[PDB]
């Protein structure tokens, strides 16, 4: 594996539901890498993936790299109201020429930023009061073996 993930630090955690996701990514060592962040929600009859953002990085600097990946927040209107205040998942992945070779999964908890809202949640979700908590210390890493050059 020419490109290996060495570390991921979630920089702004916890944060507002609408704050961008900020990952400090460290990886080691001709075609561009593509870093992707994907929102994954599970409701009763539906498993839905929503790509939150992506960044093409290239030429790939060789050796040990450290950079920050800033991903746009989710669009709440594309998400069932049930998932806005529940446990969900984000997937941070990287692809080399469109074939994924590493995927880092994180649990995400979402809840209201005030005790009154947590105990008496309104009928309509107030996204501006939702705080997300990424379980950043326990990544679920999957690595895929793939050809480079």
């Amino acid at each position, epitope marked *: 594996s020419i490109v290996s993930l060495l570390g991921i630090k979630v920089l702004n955690n916890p944060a507002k539901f609408t704050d961008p996701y900020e990952f400090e990514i460290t990886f080691e060592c001709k075609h561009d890498l593509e870093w992707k962040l994907t929102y994954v929600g599970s409701s009763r009859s539906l498993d839905h993936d929503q790509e939150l953002d992506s960044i093409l990085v290239g030429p790939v600097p060789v050796g040990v790299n450290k950079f920050v990946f800033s991903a746009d927040p989710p669009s709440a209107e594309l998400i069932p109201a049930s998932e806005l205040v529940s446990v969900t998942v984000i997937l941070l992945s990287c692809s080399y020429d469109g074939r994924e070779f590493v995927r880092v*999964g994180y649990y995400v908890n979402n809840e209201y930023d005030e005790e009154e809202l947590r105990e008496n949640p309104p009928a309509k979700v107030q996204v501006d009061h939702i705080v997300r908590n990424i379980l950043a210390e326990k990544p679920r890493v999957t690595r895929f073996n793939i050809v480079w050059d």
Partner: antibody
Amino acid sequence: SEVQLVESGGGLVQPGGSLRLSCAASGFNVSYYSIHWVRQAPGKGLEWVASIYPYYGSTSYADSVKGRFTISADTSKNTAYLQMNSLRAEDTAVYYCARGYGWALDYWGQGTLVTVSS
Amino acid sequence: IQMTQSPSSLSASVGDRVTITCRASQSVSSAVAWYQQKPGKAPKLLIYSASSLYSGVPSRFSGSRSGTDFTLTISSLQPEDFATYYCQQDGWSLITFGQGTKVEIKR
């Protein structure tokens, strides 16, 4: 390149005693993956006991072993460990170590038997 | 933080369609995996993320999720399939296994 996990260190220990299990990894770096210990009492089901996660070395433990067991990983020796203190009879089981595959476990060792008895 | 697996034992024949279910505590499909175990051997991974087939596993194995119910289906039971099967939930703080399903041969 062949991926293998080999447990060692099992055997007979008295109640209240300590025992250090080893999980020798080959074919991958033990620090780039989550490593887990899962035990199986004679004739019983699977019971997870401990996990360690990459990058930070954060750990998770089942309630029945919290405090008594400590999981760790040494990158130079490419080996993970399960330090078991204050052992009890109910800790008798075959102990497997396994490698994390996302939220799952893709490679498992052969398991090492731990018997706690006087 | 609980997995209730059923049935606990099932007798079937080669070629049968077998359905094993686990009711989980959460509906996150990423967190659920299915394993097969034979006596004196380590468990083997069959299904991960509720419905993804692990490499090398035959296509007669499949997994699904309905609410908090997770189901493993074997479409055409083969002689090497008679074994015990376990579901797993890798939760926020604890990893939980189902009690297991022992699939035996009817005769």
